[PDB]
């Protein structure tokens, strides 16, 4: 049983995009950052819903000592697609990309075809000043761009209320190339013996202020208010009195009209598909189709096809192409001969009755 109340994310969720040192610079980056003031879903605990994973997820949680162990990612959470597990015990970590069966609670029941077992220092660092009031708050960021699972973290017993307002960067911990496919996310709980803050990252542009030792003192969102773009167009944090031309504005179009004088432009497709005396294969009637608009829905409704294979063009893409000429050779033939008729084939029909050239740009239609 858990709640789904709503809180304000404030200014939070800024990490180091790269591994390059800067000092007293105002570098501007474009990447997936959690936006500025916005709504995050605050959960409780006392069942463990499977939140979606897209373009990364920002995770935050405050706790006394430990109630949350790890995370599970991947698709279908079963023994059919590869998955993840980052469960953390009291001493080490258990990063592994495998094909666990399912647990419903000793967290997996299958490791048949999987590799990439990883172990390192524990992520959760907890310190107390001889008292439990130092509620350790942990902020984690995960993303899966071009594989290469990145994890960022920053551990500090902040004031202790909840999702705070003070700025705090995130230092990377691990970077391992799993890169399978991630669409879901779930969090494991304790076993036996006020958290769960979740935010979603979006592609934005940020201006980050650097200290002289290489830390990030502050940042400015580029799309929050009418301001915060003035500070970006002449990149700085102090703008003098005056008027600045920042960008331009444009209205978007709403509808689309396709008015035409006339557009039936009837093709003989009906006259070739509604015939009653389709000639034999030995004398295949060849009909020339020109000066008409080829709508393939009229071919779609007239015949319940059994073989609509196409070679030079896509069966889905036929109404978006213009053809100089179209030839429709029609002949009734046996069943196996339907599969016989194809470019680069052989047989009593492909050799003596009708031979399809290897460079054939068109489609064939067979209906019983």
């Amino acid at each position: 049983t858990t709640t789904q109340s709503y809180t304000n994310s404030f200014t939070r969720g800024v990490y180091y995009p790269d591994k390059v040192f800067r000092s007293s610079v105002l570098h501007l980056t474009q990447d997936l950052f959690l936006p500025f003031f916005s709504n995050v879903t605050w959960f409780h605990a006392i069942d463990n819903p499977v939140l979606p994973f897209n373009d990364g997820v920002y995770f935050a949680s405050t706790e006394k000592s430990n109630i949350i162990r790890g995370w599970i990612f991947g698709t279908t959470l079963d023994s059919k697609t590869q998955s993840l597990l980052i469960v953390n015990n009291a001493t080490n970590v258990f990063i592994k990309v495998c094909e666990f069966q399912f647990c419903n609670d000793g967290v997996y029941s299958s490791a048949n075809n999987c590799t990439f077992e990883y172990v390192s220092q524990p992520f959760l660092m907890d310190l107390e000043g001889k008292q439990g009031n130092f509620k350790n708050l942990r902020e984690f960021v995960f993303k899966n761009i071009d594989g290469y699972f990145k994890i960022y973290s920053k551990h500090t017993p902040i004031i202790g209320r909840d999702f705070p307002q003070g700025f705090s960067a995130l230092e990377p911990l691990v970077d391992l190339p799993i890169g399978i496919n991630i669409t879901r996310f779930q969090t494991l709980l304790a076993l036996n013996r006020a958290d769960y803050y979740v935010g979603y990252l979006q592609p934005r542009t940020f201006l980050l202020k650097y200290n002289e030792n290489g830390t990030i003192t502050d940042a400015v969102d580029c799309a929050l208010d009418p301001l915060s773009e003035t500070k970006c167009t002449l990149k700085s944090f102090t703008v003098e009195k005056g008027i600045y031309q920042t960008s331009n504005f444009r209205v978007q179009p709403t509808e689309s009209i396709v008015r035409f004088p006339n557009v039936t432009n009837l093709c003989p497709f009906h006259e070739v598909f509604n015939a009653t005396r389709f000639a034999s294969v030995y004398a295949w009637n060849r009909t020339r189709i020109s000066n008409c608009v080829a709508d393939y829905s009229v071919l779609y409704n007239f015949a319940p096809f059994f073989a609509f294979k196409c070679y030079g063009v896509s069966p889905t893409k036929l109404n978006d192409l213009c053809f100089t000429n179209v030839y429709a050779d029609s002949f009734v033939i046996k069943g196996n001969e339907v599969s016989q008729i194809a470019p680069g084939q052989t047989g009593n029909i492909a050799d003596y009755n009708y031979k399809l050239p290897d460079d054939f740009t068109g489609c064939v239609i067979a209906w019983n």
Partner: antibody
Amino acid sequence: QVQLVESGGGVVQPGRSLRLSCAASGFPFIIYGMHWVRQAPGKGLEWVAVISFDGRNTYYADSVKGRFTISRDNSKNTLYLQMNSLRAEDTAVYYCAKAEPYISSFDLFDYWGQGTLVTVSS
Amino acid sequence: EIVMTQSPATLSVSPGERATLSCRASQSISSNLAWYHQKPGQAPRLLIYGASTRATGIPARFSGSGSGTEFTLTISSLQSEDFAVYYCQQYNNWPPLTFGGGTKVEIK
């Protein structure tokens, strides 16, 4: 409990416009995509439109492409569907369906609304 | 576009026995298919996702099997709330979304 209630349907003349709404409550609406699905009488279900969790990604069915507009408002937990140039075949009942990520971005319609009827006639 | 054909257009069985439904795909979809329950006048309910996995809160009497293009849906014991229209939906080809014709299950 999750509730999806549709509204705004009714009778309309050919060539006019109508706007539908689907209010959402009881779940974290801002982190899921939604779907509009219509069912003509005597026919099966037909997929119409889709909008992502923020709004940048939208897709349309080939039968309604260029005429139907889908949008959402996260601040009010409502979903909209603007319709323009309504023809005869657009008479059906429209359902707003929650999406649950599976294999791809959104493939399962988990909760369905009660739906509203739209009919077009002279 | 992958077209989705319902082998049984309409099925008639008395309560108690087993009903078998079949849905076919034009191209290979692996095990990506879903079933929906739909009583006259109500909103669709999800039954089976992944062609082999039962949805939450659904009795075990529902089961399905099959992969590729041939799929089956099996109900061991039909009950008073099972006579409805069943739809099979593909989601392997994500860009478009297709549905089956639907099977009507009715009391004999």
